[PDB]
Amino acid sequence: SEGVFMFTSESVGEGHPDKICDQISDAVLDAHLKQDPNAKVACETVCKTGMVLLCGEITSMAMVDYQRVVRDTIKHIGYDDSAKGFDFKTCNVLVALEQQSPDIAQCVHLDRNEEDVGAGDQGLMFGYATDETEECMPLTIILAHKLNARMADLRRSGLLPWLRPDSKTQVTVQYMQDNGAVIPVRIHTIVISVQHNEDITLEEMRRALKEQVIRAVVPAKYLDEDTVYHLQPSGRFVIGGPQGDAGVTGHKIIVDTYGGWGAHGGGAFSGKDYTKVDRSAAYAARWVAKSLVKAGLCRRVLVQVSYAIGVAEPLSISIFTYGTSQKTERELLDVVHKNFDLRPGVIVRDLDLKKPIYQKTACYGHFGRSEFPWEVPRKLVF
Amino acid sequence: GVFMFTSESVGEGHPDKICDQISDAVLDAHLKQDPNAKVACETVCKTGMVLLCGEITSMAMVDYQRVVRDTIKHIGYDDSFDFKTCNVLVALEQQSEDVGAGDQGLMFGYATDETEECMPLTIILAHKLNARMADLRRSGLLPWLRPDSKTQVTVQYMQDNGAVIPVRIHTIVISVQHNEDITLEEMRRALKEQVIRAVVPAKYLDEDTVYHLQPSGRGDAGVTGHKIIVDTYGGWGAHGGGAFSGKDYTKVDRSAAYAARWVAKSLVKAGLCRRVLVQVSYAIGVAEPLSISIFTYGTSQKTERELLDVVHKNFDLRPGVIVRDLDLKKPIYQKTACYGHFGRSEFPWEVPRKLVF
């Protein structure tokens, strides 16, 4: 075990402006899929000072109360009393969504069996896994997610009632190399900025942050006397969320995925239905990456897949195992070709992607949570 | 070892890139009058409507309508998108050396000695394909071309002790918007001869290369910060989440990422390595970086731990020093908003620092 190195990931809570827009975008997606499971949705949410704008394209036989969808999401996030900084009742909802609803045609809509239909766009997608945690994800991002989930739970239970939904966490971890695999040694640095009420002091918060959040989240084996704790380091932070800075769907794509580990091909997931390869292939690529680690073929893998618009079969598939694989990456390509079919139409069938389960992906990461079908690994015939 | 790798790129007329260009055009307009103007301008576009949203703090007075419409005109949209009939909703809120970072975040710098500009060939070719089509459109040599294009280049590599060397072109994809008065076969032939042959070196091309040209068979919502991989390295290296366009130099998502590239390119150009990934991270209100990490893919002679000492002695990566070194108060950001932020020697972060090692 030769070289020590540091690595940092960040994460944000449900009340961060960008993540509000991700959650609303997928809440809109779920609303359509509950009524029309083949609804084509591309819904970009922007938010600023008690205003929400929905923008993009929809083609659905559903009828959605966008005002209610938006306002429920914001209420659920925690901006339900104005005492928490904002009101979900006073929120402006401008809907600028180009809408169609399928017109009964003499021609059939799909001329193909849906599994053989060509990819809706081009693009690059990445799947990554690492056997350092049980959920096959980097500890840096998993801890950054769990810190936000911890604060959310303590907020909703009233145990720290001064908490407001807008939070941001960053965890730097100290690693050791092990023939291309990576093993967590200690916690280098932790940062937590979080929105608060007026009736609490910085010292109360910082102490409450260390004891009731960090100690509950991070295993004590990883925590040290030399760990740095930058807690509420910006100073005061009362006004945030919708009332704060401008939020947009697709500005937290690294937080959504792997926190710097592996790679990314550009695609924002939230707002987009399952016929968009930016989402479906990326979910499938994770599925492949996690399956290869869970089978014991490797300890750490980065998978790339690419498409062309109108072509069903992937253009290229690449495997990078950081030398932790026993077999060659070329050999492992054969294993993936024989155990998986990565055409978009087969990807939806395998992963059950017509279900309205997307709002839950819009915070705390799209990967690492076994509740989603792409996190349950496939047993491989190798 | 052999392996494949794919990068994509989009043209000036792609909805997302329109919004990136407008966002930085707005940034430049402010910096021409107030060089310390704080700008965070998110542009959304759909069907002849443009919405600007976010925060500004500037003593400049900007004709946002003119800034937006000139940008769209310059991209190539004269008539149906149209710059003359274009709605401009402006919803931008106004407020009011060892300074702390304006936010937290992760940033990555990456370089590779496969091309002269120290970038992956996959992304560089994908960029040049779009730049080629733009030039042929504006000169009238292919007047059927319209500004919205998308290119994807898959390249076949060979490993060389952690460095990567391009062997051949596996696949090329080009989708591009067009006029009604031209046939698919004319376009596809014109795509291969006048674009691809002019862009890609013939040594890399062979008769077993796949050409998916206009494969969709002859406008959607655009947003700033939806082309961040196209903006950077095309899948190679890594990304920390930050969208560059619309944000001024006091935002670390942009300034640190530009500085991290500068470090990454300097280490390759000095001959300390052939390929490197650098990570830097910050905390809000702290000037000095929290962590700095070096990953050389085993192409480095020195240890990555040793190379950390080289970077510590040759660079100061506090945001306030980063702006001074890289001259980031200049209005040069609209040019970064298409064709990649990295690989172009015209920008100060692409000129490498000679290292005392």
Residue numbers in the entry:
A (entry chain A): 14 to 395
B (entry chain B): 16 to 95, 99 to 114, 128 to 249, 257 to 395
Give the text the authors published on this PDB structure.
MAT enzymes (EC 2.5.1.6) catalyse the formation of S-adenosyl-l-methionine (SAMe) from methionine (Met) and adenosine triphosphate (ATP). MATα1 is a liver-specific enzyme that is mainly found in mature hepato­cytes, while MATα2 is expressed in extrahepatic tissues including kidney, brain and heart and also in developing liver cells. The catalytic MAT isoforms are biologically active only when they assemble as a dimer or a tetramer, as the functional active sites are formed at the dimer interface. SAMe is the principal methyl donor in the transmethylation processes of important cellular biomolecules, including DNA, RNA, proteins, neurotransmitters etc..
We have determined the crystal structure of the MATα1 R264H mutant at 2.85 Å resolution. The crystal belonged to space group C2, with 42% solvent content. Chain B contains three invisible regions, the N-terminus (Met1–Glu15), the gating loop (Asp116–Glu127) and the Phe250–Gly257 region, while chain A contains an ordered gating loop and the Phe250–Gly257 region shows a clear electron-density map. Chains A and B align well, with an r.m.s.d. of 0.076 Å, and are almost identical, despite some differences in regional flexibility. In contrast, the crystal structure of the R264H mutant of MATα1 described in the present study shows a huge difference in the dimer-interface orientation owing to the substitution of Arg264 in the central part of the dimer by His. The upper part of the mutation site becomes generally tighter (Thr262–Gly263) along the dimer interface, while the mutation site itself loosens. The dimer interface of R264H is associated with 25 hydrogen bonds and nine salt-bridge interactions, while only 18 hydrogen bonds and four salt bridges are observed at the wild-type dimer interface. All attempts to obtain a holo structure of the MATα1 R264H mutant failed and produced crystal structures of the apo form, despite the R264H mutant protein being mixed with substrates (methionine and AMP-PNP) prior to crystallization. The loss of enzymatic activity caused by this mutation may thus originate from its inability to bind the substrates in the first place, resulting from the change in the positions of the residues at the dimer interface, which is further compromised by causing a lower affinity for a tetrameric assembly and a greater propensity for dimeric assembly. Arg264 is also involved in providing enzyme stability by forming a salt bridge with Glu57; its mutation to histidine thus causes lower enzyme stability, as observed by the decreased melting temperature of the mutant.
